[PDB]
Amino acid sequence: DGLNGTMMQYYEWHLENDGQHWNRLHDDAAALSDAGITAIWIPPAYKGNSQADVGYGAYDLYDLGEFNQKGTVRTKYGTKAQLERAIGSLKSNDINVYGDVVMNHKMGADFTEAVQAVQVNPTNRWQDISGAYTIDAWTGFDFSGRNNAYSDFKWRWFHFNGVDWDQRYQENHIFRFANTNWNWRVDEENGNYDYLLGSNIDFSHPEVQDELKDWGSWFTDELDLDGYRLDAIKHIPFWYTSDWVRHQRNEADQDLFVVGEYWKDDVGALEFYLDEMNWEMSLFDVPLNYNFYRASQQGGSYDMRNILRGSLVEAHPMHAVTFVDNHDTQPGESLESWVADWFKPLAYATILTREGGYPNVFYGDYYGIPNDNISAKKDMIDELLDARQNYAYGTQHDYFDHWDVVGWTREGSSSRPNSGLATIMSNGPGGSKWMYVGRQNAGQTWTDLTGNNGASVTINGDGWGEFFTNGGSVSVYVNQ
Ligand code: NA
Ligand code: NA
Ligand code: NA
């Protein structure tokens, strides 16, 4: 019903390996719906390297915590039945389910295999640094415990094209299988960034292309997904991802949202990928992530006018999925770029109250990251979910005119009661700003949903009001 959409990544890196996360999801369903969350992005739901695996150390894409494999029956999140019980709850509470899809590699092979390989230069995979010789890579996959349920396809070295560990002499190197080429096209950082970690899948092989397509469909029907969150797609040949997506949509009756993770602080790089994609999917706004990050590290000196400059959402707010942080960017992880507590309220307001982009709430922020003493920001985020769910509607008006104090407004829509809002904030000494909000809201008295400013702004006859904000804070006034 014209209700704004808000997605949530329901997991964080340091979640407990108590296998109870799927059940948590099943109970938090309504609460989440109620708060303004319309779609949940679940973590990899299939068997990883080990049970405590977050999901990216993917081993058996058909084992959704149903078969005793890799030292466990359940995944870190729980069993298959508990996942299905969860997804059912979400559906009943009007929440779409987007599954995380890991096709770039595989890890936890059951046995090694003799393979001709050459060492490449880590900074330029095009350049070999050694001659061809036999290495013992972990490429054999039999999924013994599964017993061929759903699929009897087994993986062998000739399906991959590279690994980063030779078991024969036990050394680390970026090995390209001899007589195999690095996937293409793929991100050109390090020359060719096809290889990332684990056993890298070579998509040039038709039996691979069809197996993952076949799996994708199996997966999508089995869990009744409503979309996907495509992982590490910058290391996966672009053509195949576009291929896979089209194939997937072709097989499913239900619609399929598709956000891909092309991790590069470069909107151009993302735009390019969306060209080859024919904009048939959105991408996580990674430049925005680093914009917020820079602002958080830098302090007030950061010029708030260039906060959206460079973001993907600025350029293509229709194929953008905005967020503040995730499991990769949280403290201590691989793509760390954590937004500090002080600026995090400002960032969330930016992606949750503006009209562009598809905003995503991070579990680690909502409920907190105990591991690192990071407090649950639930209170601050709910008020903003309230903002987006009931007020952030109608014509927008921006004011990125000052280097500290900046803001924007939404006139509201006649189709949604008392909607309409005005966001004001400052990353430095506070202040106020005269902003337009629609001559139709004249006479109204607006107040701050976050409670960071007791100002009570009244809209004059011209539809104008002067809004205030304290230093390094953000307020969101609405007709409440
Ligand atoms: Na790859
Ligand atoms: Na960030
Ligand atoms: Na500033």
TrEMBL record:
Binding site residues for Ca(2+) 1: 104, 194, 235
Task: Give GO MF terms, alphabetically.
Answer: calcium ion binding; hydrolase activity, hydrolyzing O-glycosyl compounds
Q: Which residues form the Glycosyl hydrolase family 13 catalytic domain?
A: 5-409
SMART domains to which the protein is assigned, alphabetical: Aamy (SM00642)
Q: Does the keyword Cytoplasm apply?
A: no
Q: Which Gene3D superfamilies match?
A: 2.40.30.140, Glycosidases, Golgi alpha-mannosidase II
- Residues that, per the record, bind Ca(2+) 3: 300, 404
Q: Which cofactor names does the annotation list? A: Ca(2+)
Q: Where does Ca(2+) 2 bind?
A: 202
Q: Keywords assigned by UniProt?
A: Calcium, Carbohydrate metabolism, Glycosidase, Hydrolase, Metal-binding, Signal
Active-site residue numbers:
231 (nucleophile), 261 (proton donor)
- What does the entry give for GO biological process? carbohydrate metabolic process
* Database matches in Pfam families: Alpha-amy_C_pro (PF09154), Alpha-amylase (PF00128)
Q: Does the keyword Hydrolase apply?
A: yes
- What protein family is recorded? Belongs to the glycosyl hydrolase 13 family.
Name of this chain's protein? Amylase
Recall the taxonomic lineage recorded for the source organism: Bacteria, Bacillati, Bacillota, Bacilli, Bacillales
